[PDB]
């Protein structure tokens, strides 16, 4: 689709069988979801944002469906304020910025 | 223009006639510039995201040019790690996400 930016660019995702709302975020390197359970092994990681650094769990090679498009890649889980789809998965679904 | 998302979407902006690099961030409501000593009246504000909040200075009706496209609006200044263009200005230059 074409998504304008008058409102936050929120979409529905499906992950581990569950539906959630996430923000399409060109300002994020990585995809970061609010605390949740995901299957499989994970590693501790840290990431930075506007306010400083937080600890997250890194899960590799996780399938996610984003606004109807399939992606499989790294998902971080931790105390983010909102679910964020970052560039690692935006590139998989063919997203660009246009003006 | 079309900006792909393989790399951080950094573009050149002009503020006060001077050039800076900034990140096009669909996950930011507002635009925040790295610390700079801008003239004019301002008001204190807190902005938040991953890692918590930071203190910034809010300036109003500041002209900016983003990749040659002119904009005017609210510009925040503080200890962000990178200059960030948010939706308040992305909408003015007709930016969309496309997939």
């Amino acid at each position: 689709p074409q998504i304008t930016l008058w409102k936050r660019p929120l979409v529905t995702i499906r992950i581990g069988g569950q539906l959630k709302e996430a923000l399409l975020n060109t300002g994020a390197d990585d995809t970061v979801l609010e605390e949740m359970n995901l299957p499989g092994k994970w590693k501790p990681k840290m990431i930075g944002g506007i306010g400083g650094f937080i600890k997250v769990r890194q899960y590799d090679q996780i399938p996610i469906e984003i606004c109807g498009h399939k992606a499989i890649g790294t998902v971080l889980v931790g105390p983010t304020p909102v679910n964020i789809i970052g560039r690692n998965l935006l590139t998989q679904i063919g997203c660009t910025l246009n003006f | 223009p079309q900006i792909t998302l393989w790399k951080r979407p950094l573009v050149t902006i002009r503020i006060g006639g001077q050039l800076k690099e900034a990140l096009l961030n669909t996950g930011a409501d507002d635009t925040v510039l790295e610390e700079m000593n801008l003239p004019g009246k301002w008001k204190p504000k807190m902005i938040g995201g991953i890692g918590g909040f930071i203190k910034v200075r809010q300036y109003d009706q500041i002209p900016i040019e983003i990749c040659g496209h002119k904009a005017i609006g609210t510009v925040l200044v503080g200890p962000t790690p990178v200059n960030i263009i948010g939706r308040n200005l992305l909408t003015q230059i007709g930016c969309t996400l496309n997939f």
């Binding site: 975020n25 300002g27 390197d29 990585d30 990431i47 944002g49 304020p81 | 930011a28 995201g49 991953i50």
Partner: peptide
């Protein structure tokens, strides 16, 4: 309310 979701690796 929180509104700037910049994020950088690690």
């Amino acid at each position: 309310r929180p509104g700037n979701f910049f994020q950088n690796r690690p």
